[PDB]
Amino acid sequence: ARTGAEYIEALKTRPPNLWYKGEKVEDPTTHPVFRGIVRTMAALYDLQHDPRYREVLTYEEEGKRHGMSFLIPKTKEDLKRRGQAYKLWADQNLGMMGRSPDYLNAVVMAYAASADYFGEFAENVRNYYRYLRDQDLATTHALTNPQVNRARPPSGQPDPYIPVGVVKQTEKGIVVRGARMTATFPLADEVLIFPLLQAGSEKYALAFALPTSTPGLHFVCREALVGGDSPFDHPLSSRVEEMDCLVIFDDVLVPWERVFILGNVELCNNAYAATGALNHMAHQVVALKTAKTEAFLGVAALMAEGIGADVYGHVQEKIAEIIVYLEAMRAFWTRAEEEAKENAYGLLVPDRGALDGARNLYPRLYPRIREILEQIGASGLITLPSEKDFKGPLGPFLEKFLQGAALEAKERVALFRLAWDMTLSGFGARQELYERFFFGDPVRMYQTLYNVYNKEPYKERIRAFLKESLKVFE
Amino acid sequence: ARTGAEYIEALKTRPPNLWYKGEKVEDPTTHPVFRGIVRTMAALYDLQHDPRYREVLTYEEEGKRHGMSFLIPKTKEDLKRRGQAYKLWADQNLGMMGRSPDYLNAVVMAYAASADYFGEFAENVRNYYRYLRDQDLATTHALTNPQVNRARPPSGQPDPYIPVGVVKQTEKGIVVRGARMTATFPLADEVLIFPLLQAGSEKYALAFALPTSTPGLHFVCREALVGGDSPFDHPLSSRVEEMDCLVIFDDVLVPWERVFILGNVELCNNAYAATGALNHMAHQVVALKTAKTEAFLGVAALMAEGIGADVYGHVQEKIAEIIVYLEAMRAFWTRAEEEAKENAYGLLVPDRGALDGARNLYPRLYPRIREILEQIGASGLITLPSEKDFKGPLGPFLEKFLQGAALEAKERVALFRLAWDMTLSGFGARQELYERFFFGDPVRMYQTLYNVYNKEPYKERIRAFLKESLKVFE
Amino acid sequence: ARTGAEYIEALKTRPPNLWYKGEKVEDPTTHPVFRGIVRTMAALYDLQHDPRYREVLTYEEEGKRHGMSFLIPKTKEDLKRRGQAYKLWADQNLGMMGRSPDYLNAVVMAYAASADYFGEFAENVRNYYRYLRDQDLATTHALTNPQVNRARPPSGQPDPYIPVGVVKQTEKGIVVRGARMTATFPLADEVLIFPLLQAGSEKYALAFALPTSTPGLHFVCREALVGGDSPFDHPLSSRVEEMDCLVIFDDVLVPWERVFILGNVELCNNAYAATGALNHMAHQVVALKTAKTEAFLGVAALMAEGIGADVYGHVQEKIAEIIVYLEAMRAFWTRAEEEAKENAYGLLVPDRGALDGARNLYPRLYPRIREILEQIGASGLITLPSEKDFKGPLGPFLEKFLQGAALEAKERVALFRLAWDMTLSGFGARQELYERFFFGDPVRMYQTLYNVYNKEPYKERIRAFLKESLKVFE
Amino acid sequence: ARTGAEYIEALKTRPPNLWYKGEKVEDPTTHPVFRGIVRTMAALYDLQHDPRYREVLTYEEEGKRHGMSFLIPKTKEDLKRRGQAYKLWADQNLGMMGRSPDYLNAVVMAYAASADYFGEFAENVRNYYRYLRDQDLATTHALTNPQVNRARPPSGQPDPYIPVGVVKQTEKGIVVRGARMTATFPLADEVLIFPLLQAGSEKYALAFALPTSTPGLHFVCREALVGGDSPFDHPLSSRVEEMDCLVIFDDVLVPWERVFILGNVELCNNAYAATGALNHMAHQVVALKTAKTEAFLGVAALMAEGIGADVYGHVQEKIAEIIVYLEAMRAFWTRAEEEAKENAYGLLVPDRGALDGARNLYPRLYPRIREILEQIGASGLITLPSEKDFKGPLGPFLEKFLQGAALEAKERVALFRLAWDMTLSGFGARQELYERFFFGDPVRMYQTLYNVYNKEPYKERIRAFLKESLKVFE
Ligand SMILES: Cc1cc2nc3c(=O)[nH]c(=O)nc-3n(C[C@H](O)[C@H](O)[C@H](O)COP(=O)(O)OP(=O)(O)OC[C@H]3O[C@@H](n4cnc5c(N)ncnc54)[C@H](O)[C@@H]3O)c2cc1C
Ligand SMILES: Cc1cc2nc3c(=O)[nH]c(=O)nc-3n(C[C@H](O)[C@H](O)[C@H](O)COP(=O)(O)OP(=O)(O)OC[C@H]3O[C@@H](n4cnc5c(N)ncnc54)[C@H](O)[C@@H]3O)c2cc1C
C-alpha cells in the first residue's frame, strides 16, 4: 500500500504526458491546475496508513499490505469490506471525486479473477493486476471514441484512425494510432484503454494498459475548473478538480505483455459483464453516490436551518425528497451485496439487477437533488463575498447583513460557498453533466437493460392470468 | 386458518352493514357488485390449504394452523417468511388488491407484540389479536375524518360529531358518533377504527374494533367499478373491485373489551410507530407493490412484442424504466428485512428507513408506470371489442384486423383489455388515485419524514468539512 | 343549418352501420349506449337557431344560413368568427367532446378552398364541401391503419388488405378492402377516410368519403363508457360518450364522385399541410382545449374552496399552474389568428408555428392538469354516494358528513362526481389517453416539427456570434 | 440618447461604489472583472446611433432623441415598437444579459405615466423619469431584504436595521440604514431601491433612487464568473458577466426629491401592479426570453448537426421541444400586446394574463432547455481544449480528432465552448439560478397568481353545468 508521499514522488519523477493550454505540464504536483487534486489523492493513500482506518482500507497477505480495492472477494463479508472501503474514501471528498483509482482497481481485480476470459492474454491480465496491486498504482481510463460523426460507426469516420486502431503488429507488440474522447483524473501512473463495437470493427477491438508517460501518448486538458486555492472561497474546486482530457495516440507502441484483447469485437463487447468488472465497478459507484447524496442532504439541511427556511413545509418536503433518494441508493447497495452470486469464472459478484437499478436511476435523481439545493438557497447561492471581503473594511457590515438564523456570517457564507461549489460553480455544474453520462448514455444504457433483463417470468404470469380470459371461447 | 367456504358462510350469515345506492345489501356473496371480490378473498383463504403453498401461507403452533400474517417474527428468517406470504397472496391478483387482510393483520400483530404500549388496554389488544388469528377473520379499516373543512381541526367542523367522537361512557363501554371518510374492502367480519390529531382532540383520540354487523354501524358504498362478469371483457374489475365506503356511526356502542385507546391524543399519534405496526404494514406494502410492478412489466412487454413496437428504442427504454422501478422496490424490500432490529418492546421490525423510502417513492413511480403503458399501447388501449363481437358475425374480420405480430386476435384483445383494465377503466384509474394516497397525503408524509429522520450525521460531516474554510480567518 | 330534430331523424332513418357487442345497432337515437351523445350533438345543432347565438354559430349567404365551421375565411376577422363558434360549441360540453363535426368541417372547408391541390378530383372536393355545408351533415373520420405489426409498413402486414387498399377500379368507382383502426363519434351521416405513407404504398394512398350506411361498411364499437343516465351520478358520461370504433371495409364500393385522392403517396402525405386543413383543424383544437382547461380550472377552484383546502399554499399553487396553462393556450390561439397569412392557394390560414406549439404542448399539459385535480380532491374523488343514497334512509346522515366548508352535501357530491367523471371514471380516464394521442403520436409529431421548422435563422445568429471566436486565429 | 463613449466616461468619472475581494474598484471600465460587461453595455448604447437601428432603438421628440424604452406608449403600435427595441438589444447578447437598463426604464416609464399613484411624491417621479430619459442613464435595482431569518418578518430580524429602514427624517431628506440582498449589473449611474411587506413594516416601506457613487452606499461583489478574455475560450463570460452584489446603506442620506414612497406599506405592495410597471417590465422579459430561447435553439441545432447526432429521433424530438417552448413565448408576447388595455391612470399596459403566464412558465421551461443542451452535447461539452492548444504543437492532432460531421475542428470547439458557457461554466450555471428566481420565488409568485386571478367565470360555468345534477332531487 502506497503512502501519499510515494504517489507524489512518482508523479514528480515520471509525470503523465499532460498538456494545458498548449504547453506540457512538467510537474503536476506543483502546477496550479493540478496540485490540489494531487494532494487530495495523496491524502487518500495516506489514509490507508492511519491506525483508525488501516483495517478498513487495506488487508494483509503473506507479509504484504494491499489496498482493499484489490481484494478478490470470496464471501459476502468480503464484498461488504470492499464496500466499506469505497465509502470511507468517498466520504473524504463528499462523493465529489468520481474517478478515484478504486473504481478501476475493481475492474482490474475482476478481470484478473476471471482471467480465463481473455484466452492467451490471461496471464498478461493476472500479471497486470499483481503489478497494480503490489505497487498500489493510480489509474485513469478512456473508453469512448472521438465524437466526430455519430451517424457512422468507428470505421466510417473522416479518417480510419480517428478512433484508436492497430496500425501494425511487430515482435515487440502493437502500434496504435487514434484518440479516446475522455479520460478523467489523468494524475495517474497508468492509463487503461479498455472496451459496444459493431461487427467489422476488429482493428478497434482492443484492450490494453500503458504508463502515462509513454512516448507518443498525450493528454490534452480541457478548461480548468479550479476556482482558486482558498478553501473558504472554493471549498471543493480548490481540491477535487480531477480534470478531463482528450487522449492522443501518436503511433504508440504497446508491448505484448500489456495487451489484454486484440481484434476481437465480441470479446470486447462482453468484457465487463462476463468478467464481473461491471458488477464490481458499479458497486464502487453505488457506495460513492450514497456518500454524495449524504453530502447534499447535509448541506440542504444546514442551508434551510441556516436561513430559517426550514419552517416552510415545501422546504421540509424537498429535504425529505433527498432522504428518499438516499434510502433508495442505500437499498440498492444492500441488495447488491446480499444477493451476490458467483459468475461463470467463480468470482463472487454483487447483484447486477440492483446495480443496474442504481446506475440507471441515479442519473435521473442527481439533477433533481441539485435542483433542490438551488430552490432552497435561492439568492443566497450567488451572494458570495470572499474571505477577503470579511477581512477587509466592510467586514463588520457583512457580519451583520449575512448572518443567518442563529448562524454567524462567516459560517453562513462558508456554507453557501460550499453549496454553490457543489452546484453552480463551473466545478459544480460539471458534476451534473458527469452524473448524467459517466457510466454511459442513458438512452443506450436503458436499451441495454431492456435487452439483457429476463422479462419472461412476468410475461408468463400475465399469460397465465389471461387463460381465464380466453376460456370464454371454449 | 380459514377456508374460502367458511369466509363465504360467515359473510352470508352475518353480512357487513353495507348500503348500495340507497338499499341495504342483504347478501354480498351473491350481489352483483360484491360477489366478485368475495370470491377473490375466498380464493386467497383457500390457497392456505393448497399443499403447494401451505408451508408458505401458514404456520403450525400447538396443534393449530395460523395464517402467516399473524406470526410474531423473532428472527430475520421469520420476517422473510412473512414477506413471502405477502408476495404470494399479492401475485394472485397482480398486486391489484390493495387491502387484503394481511395488511391489517400485520398491524394487529405488532399492536399485540407491543401491547404494553396501550397500558390498561393491553390485554384487550392481546385478546383481540388472538381472536383475529384463531378465527382467521377478515378486517377493514377507516382512519380519516370526513373531508368537510380541511382548514379547521376535528373539533372545528360544522358539528362536533362529524368526526367519530365519544358521546358518553357507560358500564358496558363507550358510545361513539360520527363518521370515517373511507374504508376499503368492507367485505370483512371486523372493522378497525384506529388512529395526526392536534392537542384538544381528546374526544376523537380513539382506537377500537367492531364486528361489521354492529347495530348503528353503516358502510355507504361509492359508485361501483365492476365492469361486468366476463373475464375477457373485464379481467380485473370483474374480480378485484374491493369497493370504498363512508363509515357511519349512529350512536354505536363499543364494548370495553374492544377499546384499545381512549381519549389520549399522543398515544394515538405514536401508535403505529411505537408498536412497529408502521414497519410491518409497510413491509406488506413493499411486497405488494413489487408484485404490482411485476405485473405492469409483464403487460408492457407483452403489449410491445404483441404489436411489434418493441423494435423501437424509446419503447425499449420505457420498459427498462419499469425494470428500474421494479429493482428499486425489490431493493427497499431486501434492505427492510436485512436491517431489521427490535423496537422498545422487543418486537423485531423491518427497517423504517428503507420502508419510508419505498412508501414515499412508489406514489411518484406508479403514475409514471401507468403512463408508460398508455404510451406503449396508444389506440390499442381503446380498440376493445367484446368477446361477444368475436362470437358474432364480424368475428372473422376481427381475427384478421386485430391480430398482432405473431399473436392471435383473441389473445391480443384479451391482453389489451387487461392493460386497459389496469389503467383506463374506472377500476384502473381508481388504482392510480389509490397509489397516490392510500398511505397518506404525500405533502404531509414528506413533512413527517423530514421531522423524524435523523439528519445530524450528515450535517456534522458538512460542519467538519467546513472547518478548513473557517480556518482562513485564524 | 340543421336543427337537432333533423339530425335525430336522419340517424333514425339512415343509421350508421354500428355494431355493439356482436349485434347491429338498429336505432342509435334510442339505444342506451348512444342516445346520450346523440342528444348532445342534437343540442349543438339546435344552438345554431337560438337567437342568442345564431350570429355566432351561422352566417347568411344568398338566402341560406350555414354553420360557421363551413365559412371560407377571407380576413382575420373571419378567422376570429370561426374561432368564436368553435369555442361556443366547446363550452357546451366543458371541452369534453373532442370530435364534434366542426373539426372535420374545418378540414373539408380547407380542402375545398385549396381544391386545385387534388388535380382531376378538385371538383369532387368542392362538390363534397357544398354537400356537407348545404345539408349541414355530421362527419366522423378514421386515418390510421390497424395496429398489427408496427415494425413493418402497410404493405408488410400479415395480409395485403389489413390496411384499407384498392382491390380494383371499375366504371362506377373503386372497390376498397381493409380497416381503419379508430373512428371517434360514429353517430354521423358521413365518414371521411382521409390520409405518413412510405414509398410503395400506392394502393393505400387514398382519400374518400362515404355515407355511414354504405353496404360493406361496419363500425365495431369498443366497450361503452356510459356510466348511467343520472346527470348527478354521471354528469359527463351520461351525455358526452362519443364512442370509438374499428372501421371495417368489406369490399366497399366508393363512387368516383367521392374519390379525392387515388394512388398518390406524396399527395396524401402533404394533403393537410398544403391545403391548410392542418391549420384550420388545429385552430378548432386550440379553442377546444382552452375551453377544456377553463372547465378544469373551474372544478379545481370549486373543489378547493368546497373542502377548505384553498387555504393551503400548495393547493393555491396547483390551481395557479392550471391558470398558467390556460393562458398559454389562449396565447397560442391569439397568435395563430393574428399571424395568419394566405397559403399557396390563397386560403387564409392561422399560423402553423403557434398551432404546432399548442398541439404539441397540450398533450404534455393535460396529464398534469388531470393530476392536479387528483391531488386536490384526494379521497373526496372516490367518496361518491349516489343520488339514490341521498334519497334513501341514510340521506340525513350524508347531508351531515359530506357537506363542505359552506357547501351543502348534495352540491358537494355533485361537484366531486363531476371531478371524478372528468378524471377517474372510465370516461374520464379515456380523455387522458385521447389528449395524449388524438392528433398523433408525440414521438413522431415532434420529429415532424423538427423537420419542417425553419431553424436557419437561429443557426445563422449563432454562426455570426462565433465569428469573434474564430478571429483569434487570424 | 447616450453613446457608448459617454457611458464609459461617466463610469470612469463617477464610478459606482463597487468592492471586489476587500478592495474598492477605482475604475470598472478597465478592471479585469468589469471591463467586459462595461464594453457590452457601451455597445448597446452605440447601437442607438447605428443608421440601421436608430429608428428601432430611439424616437424623436421636440429636437431630442430618446431611447425607445422611455417611450410612453399610446397605441398598440407603440407597444410593438417598445417590444422590437427590447428584442433587438436582447439579441446582441443572445438573451444572456438579464438586467440591461431598458427593463428598469420600463418600470420608471410606467411609474411616471401613473405618477398620480405616488401622491405628494408624484412630481419627484415625473422629474426622475425625465432625468433618466434625457441623460439616458443606466440603472440597477435591489428589491429584496437580506436572507437572514426567513421565518420572521423584516421587523423581526436579529437587528431592526438589517433590512433598509428609515433612521430619521430631516429638512434635507431621509437617512436610511440597512442592506438589500441583490443588485445585478451595478455598472450603472443610478440605483433604484424600490418595493410584499406585512403590516407593521412602515419604516421599511420605501421607494427611492440614488447615484451609485453616493457616500455611505456600497456594492459588495460576489465571486466573479469571468472565465477570461478570449472570445474563443469564453464567448459569453468574457463579455456578459453582469455581476451580482449585496447593497449596503451606511446611514445614507436620500434627498427629498429622490423619495417616491415613504412609510406606506400598501402603496409599496401595489406599486408595480397599479402603475403598470409590472406589465411593462414583464413585456421586456418576454421579448428577452424569446431571444434567449432562440439562441439555445440555434446552438442545439448546430451541435446536433455538428456531431451527426441529428439523425437520431430522440435528438430531433429534444430540439423540437425547444421549438415548442420558443413558440409558447412568442405567443405570450403577441397576446400581451394584442390584448393591451389602459389602466386606471390611462396608461396602455400589455395584458397581465399573458405576461403572468410567460413569467411563471419560463422558470419551469429554462431548466429543461438547459438540460436538453446537456443531453445533446454529452462529453463534447467538457472536451474543451483552448485556442492556445490549437495554436500549440498538438494543433494538427486536434484538427483531426475534434472535427465534426462536415465541420472543422476549430469551429466545432468554438461552438461547444459556447454551449458550455451557456450551461456549465460558472457563468452558464448562474443563468439557470437567475431564470428560476429573478422575478421572484415561484412558490410565492404562484400563490400571488392564484389570489389575483379572476376565477369566477370558470366557477360559474361549472355551477351552471351542475344545475342538471341537482335537479334530480326536485
Ligand atoms: C464529466 C464527464 C466525465 C467523463 N469521464 C470519463 C472517463 O473517465 N472515462 C471514459 O471512458 N469516459 C468518460 N466520460 C464519457 C462518457 O462515458 C460518455 O459521455 C458517454 O458514454 C456517452 O457518449 P458520448 O459522450 O460520446 O455522446 P454521444 O454518443 O456523442 O451522443 C450525443 C447525443 O447523441 C446521442 N446519440 C449518439 N449516438 C446515438 C445512438 N447510437 N443511439 C441513440 N442516440 C445516439 C446521445 O443520445 C445524445 O443525445 C465522461 C463524461 C463526462 C460528461
Ligand atoms: C382509493 C383510495 C382508497 C383508500 N382506502 C383507505 C382505507 O382503506 N382506510 C383508510 O383509513 N383510508 C383510506 N384512504 C384514505 C387516505 O388515507 C387519504 O386519502 C389520505 O390520507 C389523505 O387525506 P384526505 O383524502 O382526507 O385529503 P385531504 O386532507 O382532504 O386533502 C385534500 C388536499 O388538501 C390538502 N391539504 C389538506 N390539509 C392539509 C394540510 N394540513 N397541510 C397541507 N395540505 C393540506 C392535501 O394536500 C390535498 O392537496 C383511501 C384513499 C383512496 C384515494
mmCIF file with all atom_site columns, C-alpha atoms in Angstrom, chain C residues 207-301:
data_model
loop_
_atom_site.group_PDB
_atom_site.id
_atom_site.type_symbol
_atom_site.label_atom_id
_atom_site.label_alt_id
_atom_site.label_comp_id
_atom_site.label_asym_id
_atom_site.label_entity_id
_atom_site.label_seq_id
_atom_site.pdbx_PDB_ins_code
_atom_site.Cartn_x
_atom_site.Cartn_y
_atom_site.Cartn_z
_atom_site.occupancy
_atom_site.B_iso_or_equiv
_atom_site.pdbx_formal_charge
_atom_site.auth_seq_id
_atom_site.auth_comp_id
_atom_site.auth_asym_id
_atom_site.auth_atom_id
_atom_site.pdbx_PDB_model_num
ATOM 1  C CA . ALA C 1 207 ? -58.748 9.805  -49.669 1.00 0.00 ? 207 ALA C CA 1
ATOM 2  C CA . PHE C 1 208 ? -62.529 9.476  -49.984 1.00 0.00 ? 208 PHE C CA 1
ATOM 3  C CA . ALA C 1 209 ? -65.825 9.906  -48.112 1.00 0.00 ? 209 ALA C CA 1
ATOM 4  C CA . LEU C 1 210 ? -68.895 7.690  -47.705 1.00 0.00 ? 210 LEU C CA 1
ATOM 5  C CA . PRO C 1 211 ? -72.362 7.668  -46.131 1.00 0.00 ? 211 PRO C CA 1
ATOM 6  C CA . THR C 1 212 ? -72.106 5.769  -42.833 1.00 0.00 ? 212 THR C CA 1
ATOM 7  C CA . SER C 1 213 ? -74.792 3.326  -44.007 1.00 0.00 ? 213 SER C CA 1
ATOM 8  C CA . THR C 1 214 ? -72.830 2.163  -47.065 1.00 0.00 ? 214 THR C CA 1
ATOM 9  C CA . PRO C 1 215 ? -73.108 -1.609 -47.680 1.00 0.00 ? 215 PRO C CA 1
ATOM 10 C CA . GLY C 1 216 ? -69.996 -3.456 -46.541 1.00 0.00 ? 216 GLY C CA 1
ATOM 11 C CA . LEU C 1 217 ? -69.015 -0.669 -44.143 1.00 0.00 ? 217 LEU C CA 1
ATOM 12 C CA . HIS C 1 218 ? -69.041 -1.592 -40.448 1.00 0.00 ? 218 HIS C CA 1
ATOM 13 C CA . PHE C 1 219 ? -68.248 0.294  -37.244 1.00 0.00 ? 219 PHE C CA 1
ATOM 14 C CA . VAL C 1 220 ? -67.320 -2.043 -34.390 1.00 0.00 ? 220 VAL C CA 1
ATOM 15 C CA . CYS C 1 221 ? -67.748 -0.293 -31.040 1.00 0.00 ? 221 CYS C CA 1
ATOM 16 C CA . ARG C 1 222 ? -65.406 -0.720 -28.096 1.00 0.00 ? 222 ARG C CA 1
ATOM 17 C CA . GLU C 1 223 ? -66.589 -1.229 -24.519 1.00 0.00 ? 223 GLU C CA 1
ATOM 18 C CA . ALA C 1 224 ? -69.073 1.558  -23.724 1.00 0.00 ? 224 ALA C CA 1
ATOM 19 C CA . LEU C 1 225 ? -68.111 4.104  -21.070 1.00 0.00 ? 225 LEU C CA 1
ATOM 20 C CA . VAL C 1 226 ? -71.589 5.434  -20.294 1.00 0.00 ? 226 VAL C CA 1
ATOM 21 C CA . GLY C 1 227 ? -71.864 5.179  -16.520 1.00 0.00 ? 227 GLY C CA 1
ATOM 22 C CA . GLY C 1 228 ? -75.612 5.636  -16.471 1.00 0.00 ? 228 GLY C CA 1
ATOM 23 C CA . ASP C 1 229 ? -78.321 8.177  -17.262 1.00 0.00 ? 229 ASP C CA 1
ATOM 24 C CA . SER C 1 230 ? -78.380 10.114 -13.990 1.00 0.00 ? 230 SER C CA 1
ATOM 25 C CA . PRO C 1 231 ? -76.860 13.578 -14.507 1.00 0.00 ? 231 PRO C CA 1
ATOM 26 C CA . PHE C 1 232 ? -75.996 13.637 -10.799 1.00 0.00 ? 232 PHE C CA 1
ATOM 27 C CA . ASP C 1 233 ? -74.203 10.283 -10.760 1.00 0.00 ? 233 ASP C CA 1
ATOM 28 C CA . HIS C 1 234 ? -72.672 10.598 -14.239 1.00 0.00 ? 234 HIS C CA 1
ATOM 29 C CA . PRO C 1 235 ? -72.650 14.298 -15.235 1.00 0.00 ? 235 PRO C CA 1
ATOM 30 C CA . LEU C 1 236 ? -70.466 13.754 -18.299 1.00 0.00 ? 236 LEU C CA 1
ATOM 31 C CA . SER C 1 237 ? -70.509 10.089 -19.354 1.00 0.00 ? 237 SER C CA 1
ATOM 32 C CA . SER C 1 238 ? -74.306 10.144 -19.490 1.00 0.00 ? 238 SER C CA 1
ATOM 33 C CA . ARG C 1 239 ? -74.136 12.680 -22.315 1.00 0.00 ? 239 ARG C CA 1
ATOM 34 C CA . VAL C 1 240 ? -70.685 13.068 -23.898 1.00 0.00 ? 240 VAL C CA 1
ATOM 35 C CA . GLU C 1 241 ? -69.533 9.475  -24.532 1.00 0.00 ? 241 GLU C CA 1
ATOM 36 C CA . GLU C 1 242 ? -68.641 9.828  -28.224 1.00 0.00 ? 242 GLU C CA 1
ATOM 37 C CA . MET C 1 243 ? -67.605 6.171  -28.652 1.00 0.00 ? 243 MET C CA 1
ATOM 38 C CA . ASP C 1 244 ? -64.575 4.850  -30.566 1.00 0.00 ? 244 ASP C CA 1
ATOM 39 C CA . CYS C 1 245 ? -64.770 2.125  -33.175 1.00 0.00 ? 245 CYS C CA 1
ATOM 40 C CA . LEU C 1 246 ? -62.794 -0.039 -35.570 1.00 0.00 ? 246 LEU C CA 1
ATOM 41 C CA . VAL C 1 247 ? -63.885 0.642  -39.155 1.00 0.00 ? 247 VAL C CA 1
ATOM 42 C CA . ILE C 1 248 ? -64.238 -2.359 -41.472 1.00 0.00 ? 248 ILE C CA 1
ATOM 43 C CA . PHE C 1 249 ? -64.424 -2.215 -45.275 1.00 0.00 ? 249 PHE C CA 1
ATOM 44 C CA . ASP C 1 250 ? -65.734 -5.458 -46.755 1.00 0.00 ? 250 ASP C CA 1
ATOM 45 C CA . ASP C 1 251 ? -65.192 -4.812 -50.478 1.00 0.00 ? 251 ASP C CA 1
ATOM 46 C CA . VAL C 1 252 ? -66.935 -1.454 -50.302 1.00 0.00 ? 252 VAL C CA 1
ATOM 47 C CA . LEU C 1 253 ? -67.703 0.425  -53.492 1.00 0.00 ? 253 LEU C CA 1
ATOM 48 C CA . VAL C 1 254 ? -66.617 4.062  -53.449 1.00 0.00 ? 254 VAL C CA 1
ATOM 49 C CA . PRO C 1 255 ? -68.306 6.035  -56.268 1.00 0.00 ? 255 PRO C CA 1
ATOM 50 C CA . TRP C 1 256 ? -65.895 8.060  -58.398 1.00 0.00 ? 256 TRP C CA 1
ATOM 51 C CA . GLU C 1 257 ? -67.523 11.309 -57.243 1.00 0.00 ? 257 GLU C CA 1
ATOM 52 C CA . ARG C 1 258 ? -66.467 10.506 -53.665 1.00 0.00 ? 258 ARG C CA 1
ATOM 53 C CA . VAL C 1 259 ? -62.789 9.940  -54.504 1.00 0.00 ? 259 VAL C CA 1
ATOM 54 C CA . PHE C 1 260 ? -60.432 12.803 -53.624 1.00 0.00 ? 260 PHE C CA 1
ATOM 55 C CA . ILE C 1 261 ? -57.004 11.149 -53.853 1.00 0.00 ? 261 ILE C CA 1
ATOM 56 C CA . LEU C 1 262 ? -56.125 7.891  -55.592 1.00 0.00 ? 262 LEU C CA 1
ATOM 57 C CA . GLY C 1 263 ? -52.805 6.057  -55.551 1.00 0.00 ? 263 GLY C CA 1
ATOM 58 C CA . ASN C 1 264 ? -50.630 9.079  -54.816 1.00 0.00 ? 264 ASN C CA 1
ATOM 59 C CA . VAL C 1 265 ? -48.407 8.754  -51.747 1.00 0.00 ? 265 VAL C CA 1
ATOM 60 C CA . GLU C 1 266 ? -46.927 12.261 -51.807 1.00 0.00 ? 266 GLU C CA 1
ATOM 61 C CA . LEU C 1 267 ? -50.316 13.870 -52.408 1.00 0.00 ? 267 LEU C CA 1
ATOM 62 C CA . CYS C 1 268 ? -51.650 12.003 -49.363 1.00 0.00 ? 268 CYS C CA 1
ATOM 63 C CA . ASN C 1 269 ? -48.695 12.873 -47.136 1.00 0.00 ? 269 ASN C CA 1
ATOM 64 C CA . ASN C 1 270 ? -48.882 16.615 -47.824 1.00 0.00 ? 270 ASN C CA 1
ATOM 65 C CA . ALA C 1 271 ? -52.682 16.956 -48.047 1.00 0.00 ? 271 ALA C CA 1
ATOM 66 C CA . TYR C 1 272 ? -53.302 18.554 -44.644 1.00 0.00 ? 272 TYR C CA 1
ATOM 67 C CA . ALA C 1 273 ? -50.345 20.930 -44.770 1.00 0.00 ? 273 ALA C CA 1
ATOM 68 C CA . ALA C 1 274 ? -50.691 22.031 -48.395 1.00 0.00 ? 274 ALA C CA 1
ATOM 69 C CA . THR C 1 275 ? -54.436 22.681 -48.218 1.00 0.00 ? 275 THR C CA 1
ATOM 70 C CA . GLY C 1 276 ? -54.347 24.405 -44.850 1.00 0.00 ? 276 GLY C CA 1
ATOM 71 C CA . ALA C 1 277 ? -56.605 21.765 -43.312 1.00 0.00 ? 277 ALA C CA 1
ATOM 72 C CA . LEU C 1 278 ? -53.890 21.227 -40.705 1.00 0.00 ? 278 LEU C CA 1
ATOM 73 C CA . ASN C 1 279 ? -54.004 24.905 -39.705 1.00 0.00 ? 279 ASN C CA 1
ATOM 74 C CA . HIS C 1 280 ? -57.789 25.123 -39.515 1.00 0.00 ? 280 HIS C CA 1
ATOM 75 C CA . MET C 1 281 ? -58.383 21.837 -37.715 1.00 0.00 ? 281 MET C CA 1
ATOM 76 C CA . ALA C 1 282 ? -55.685 22.803 -35.188 1.00 0.00 ? 282 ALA C CA 1
ATOM 77 C CA . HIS C 1 283 ? -57.468 26.143 -34.771 1.00 0.00 ? 283 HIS C CA 1
ATOM 78 C CA . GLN C 1 284 ? -60.621 24.296 -33.658 1.00 0.00 ? 284 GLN C CA 1
ATOM 79 C CA . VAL C 1 285 ? -58.421 22.252 -31.342 1.00 0.00 ? 285 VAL C CA 1
ATOM 80 C CA . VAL C 1 286 ? -56.769 25.195 -29.593 1.00 0.00 ? 286 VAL C CA 1
ATOM 81 C CA . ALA C 1 287 ? -60.169 26.782 -28.923 1.00 0.00 ? 287 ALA C CA 1
ATOM 82 C CA . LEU C 1 288 ? -61.431 23.399 -27.695 1.00 0.00 ? 288 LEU C CA 1
ATOM 83 C CA . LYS C 1 289 ? -58.522 22.850 -25.300 1.00 0.00 ? 289 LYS C CA 1
ATOM 84 C CA . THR C 1 290 ? -58.860 26.393 -23.999 1.00 0.00 ? 290 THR C CA 1
ATOM 85 C CA . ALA C 1 291 ? -62.487 25.544 -23.141 1.00 0.00 ? 291 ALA C CA 1
ATOM 86 C CA . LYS C 1 292 ? -61.408 22.242 -21.595 1.00 0.00 ? 292 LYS C CA 1
ATOM 87 C CA . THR C 1 293 ? -58.745 23.897 -19.453 1.00 0.00 ? 293 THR C CA 1
ATOM 88 C CA . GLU C 1 294 ? -61.283 26.509 -18.311 1.00 0.00 ? 294 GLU C CA 1
ATOM 89 C CA . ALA C 1 295 ? -63.557 23.707 -17.112 1.00 0.00 ? 295 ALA C CA 1
ATOM 90 C CA . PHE C 1 296 ? -60.743 22.047 -15.174 1.00 0.00 ? 296 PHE C CA 1
ATOM 91 C CA . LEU C 1 297 ? -59.820 25.392 -13.598 1.00 0.00 ? 297 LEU C CA 1
ATOM 92 C CA . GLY C 1 298 ? -63.411 25.927 -12.506 1.00 0.00 ? 298 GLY C CA 1
ATOM 93 C CA . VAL C 1 299 ? -63.705 22.466 -10.967 1.00 0.00 ? 299 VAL C CA 1
ATOM 94 C CA . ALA C 1 300 ? -60.310 22.669 -9.253  1.00 0.00 ? 300 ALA C CA 1
ATOM 95 C CA . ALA C 1 301 ? -61.211 26.020 -7.696  1.00 0.00 ? 301 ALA C CA 1
#
